């Protein structure tokens, strides 16, 4: 993936739709309730993100990368992991716990 930037910073956003996932794999769960976020988070409990990546840079160099999740309780990006990424593959993943607020 080519990360172009004019500011020295670029973003790769991912969106995960738990409604369609829960409708497909668990259609018995009532996702129409005002409590659907609590039901889905109480059902999943603890979520971990695994994210294996490398940078197309010289093997002696590295770039700072942050894995972030949006927290809707505080309306901000929360940093869950900070790593230096080089030519070598690394998992930058983290356990984010309960997903209700995400």
């Amino acid at each position: 993936l080519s990360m172009q930037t004019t500011s020295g910073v670029s973003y790769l956003y991912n969106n995960f739709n738990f409604r369609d996932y829960m409708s497909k794999y668990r259609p018995q769960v009532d996702l129409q309730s005002d409590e659907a976020r609590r039901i889905v988070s109480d059902y999943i409990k603890e979520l971990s993100i695994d994210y294996y990546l490398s940078a197309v840079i010289p093997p002696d160099e590295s770039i700072e990368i942050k894995l972030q999740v949006y927290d809707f309780s505080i309306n901000r990006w929360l940093t869950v992991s900070i790593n230096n990424l080089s030519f070598y593959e690394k998992n930058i993943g983290s356990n984010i716990g309960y997903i209700k607020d995400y």
Binding site: R19, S23, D30, L31, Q32, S33, D34, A36
Partner: protein, 58 residues
């Protein structure tokens, strides 16, 4: 809970919105179709409640 994700019915009695005015050459939202019948059913409920009550034998 028809305001949920599958349907997204936008009906709410406080808004005092009585009619869905469709326009040509635009998407036909399923939420609009749900609200179209929800408005009529709500006003039919009001019309019944001003005469009858929950359990009234006809």
């Amino acid at each position: 809970n028809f305001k949920g994700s599958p349907y997204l019915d936008r009906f709410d009695p406080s808004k005092d919105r009585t009619k869905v005015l469709f326009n040509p050459d635009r998407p036909l939202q399923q939420a609009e179709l749900n609200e179209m019948q929800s408005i009529d059913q709500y006003y039919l409920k009001n019309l019944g409640d001003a005469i009858f009550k929950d359990g009234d034998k006809q």
